[PDB]
């Protein structure tokens, strides 16, 4: 089997991407944030505290003839941005782009933090990291990809995120029309539950490439590119007037600037992020200070190749017995 679904930016900045997902019988379609940095499929639901729902579409398990309470199971998750959610668990039929999993754990939110409530465009998350990170207790549950893997033509999914435009998540096949050149594959460590890999270095603009190992995670659920402070300082030093602002929470730059590109290494290959992809617009409406798309990871504990980086590439998440990641230009 295969599946193919379009993923769409939630706003004009590409702050996140939503992909329609069919849950239950008859289908209830929710728009979920596919997140290769986490491993829970959770949804706004008929059980979510009413004051914490503001415009989202909810899953109502009582209206699904295939929903079954997973008795005793609870879940609770906290994300790197400080947001969180928790609740109970149903199993139900879940389909993405024509690919169907029966008995998928659908984690029904009883509580969500304010940032979820305040984002009316995201009806939940669909985790695509390794199932060892799944938070369901006392019986850990498998991700959608893990449940589908055996049925797929090839044990892979691909992320093809657009810049200010829709893109595609494919399951079970590699669309050879979706990228240019060849795909360069690189080793993955699953020891932290992430799609964790080592970039071979970077360049700023037309500058010379610096060979240096940068361990980080391919995370479709993180908006920006978070890298060591040395790398980020070297980037922003090429932008007149750019500075790190503790009050804003990162590097800002004059909105009048033209930003240089940023290149990262994948083995001997190179992925170029155009300068425009690094512009996240005014810090507040009408400001001439703009927020940068490359930020320091110093406070996180891990480097994160988020959407800023991934949308410059066609990315293969290879879930073979030994997982690997592939990157191609497009």
Curated annotation (Swiss-Prot):
Single Gene Ontology MF annotation: aspartic-type endopeptidase activity
UniProtKB keywords: Aspartyl protease, Disulfide bond, Hydrolase, Protease, Signal, Zymogen
Active-site residues (renumbered): 35, 199
Catalytic reaction annotation: Hydrolysis of proteins with specificity similar to that of pepsin A, prefers hydrophobic residues at P1 and P1', but does not cleave 14-Ala-|-Leu-15 in the B chain of insulin or Z-Glu-Tyr. Clots milk
Domain Peptidase A1: 17-328
GO biological process entries: proteolysis
Keyword NAD: no
Domain of life (superkingdom): Eukaryota
E.C. number: 3.4.23.22
Disulfide bonds: 255-290
Family statement: Belongs to the peptidase A1 family.
Protein name: Endothiapepsin
Provenance organism: Cryphonectria parasitica (Chestnut blight fungus)
Lineage of the organism: Eukaryota, Fungi, Dikarya, Ascomycota, Pezizomycotina
Residue window of the full protein shown: 90 to 419 of 419
